[PDB]
Paper text:
Extracellular matrix binding protein (Embp) and its subdomains referred to as the F-repeat and the FG-repeat are critical for adherence of S. epidermidis to surface-immobilized Fn. Embp is a giant 1-MDa surface protein consisting of 10,203 amino acids (aa). High-resolution structure analysis of F- and FG-repeats revealed that both repeats are composed of two tightly connected triple α-helix bundles, exhibiting an elongated but rather rigid structural organization in solution. Both F- and FG-repeat possess Fn-binding capacity via interactions with type III subdomain FN12, involving residues within the C and F β-sheet.
A high-resolution crystal structure was obtained for the first F-repeat (corresponding to aa 2569 to 2738 of the full-length Embp). The F-repeat consists of two three-helix bundles and reveals an elongated shape approximately 70 Å in length and 30 Å in width and height. The N-terminal bundle is referred to as F-3H-N, and the C-terminal bundle as F-3H-C. Within F-3H-N, the first helix α1 (aa 2571 to 2584) and the second helix α2 (aa 2599 to 2623) are connected by an extended loop (aa 2585 to 2598). This loop (referred to as the Sandwich-loop [S-loop]) is involved in several stabilizing hydrogen bonds and van der Waals interactions between F-3H-N, a linear linker L2 and F-3H-C, potentially important for the structural integrity of the F-repeat as a compact unit. The analysis of the F-repeat surface characteristics reveals a prominent deep major groove as key structural feature. The wide groove shows an area of approximately 1,200 Å2 comprising a volume of 890 Å3 and is flanked by helix α2 (from F-3H-N) and helices α4, α5, and α6 (from F-3H-C). Compared to the FG-repeat, the crystal structure of the F-repeat reveals some similarities but also significant differences. Most importantly, the F-repeat misses a common long central helix, being relevant for structural integrity of the FG-repeat. Within the F-repeat, however, cohesion between α-helical bundles is supported by a so-called Sandwich-loop, a structural feature not described before. Based on the high-resolution structure, it appears that the F-repeat part of Embp is likely to be less tight and rigid than the FG-repeat containing region.
Numbering used by the authors: 6 to 108, 120 to 173
The structure:
Amino acid sequence: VNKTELINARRRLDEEISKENKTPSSIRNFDQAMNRAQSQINTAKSDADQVIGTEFATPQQVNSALSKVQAAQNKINEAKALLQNKADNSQLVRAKEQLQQSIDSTRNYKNKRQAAEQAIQHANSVINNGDATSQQINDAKNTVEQAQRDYVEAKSN
């Protein structure tokens, strides 16, 4: 039997869904939907892994596992659809700075320094977790990069 489509669909279940530049509320919604779907996803992953590892798998077993994987992928895509892009505030930042010059930054700096320290602690926890998923690693990377961007901006005004 040709397992190509099942293998490819099974691998797609593990792909990172990017949270880069997504709103914090929409990320919460995504994580909440993924948790609701998690047992269905895990069962699809497990059944597909068994078929993939079956040396003499049948087309029926491949097709049944593929159907489960496709339904699990639809659940992931439903969760992904909750993610929303942040809106760009760069022109508002520049306008605010121009108004300030025409006429609390320390607290804001300290808040963003703390956010950077928390991002480093979160990254270390993920790095040290041998069970970490591609999604968890990528989420932590995006959090680190956002904390760096926010820190530089807060120390620069």
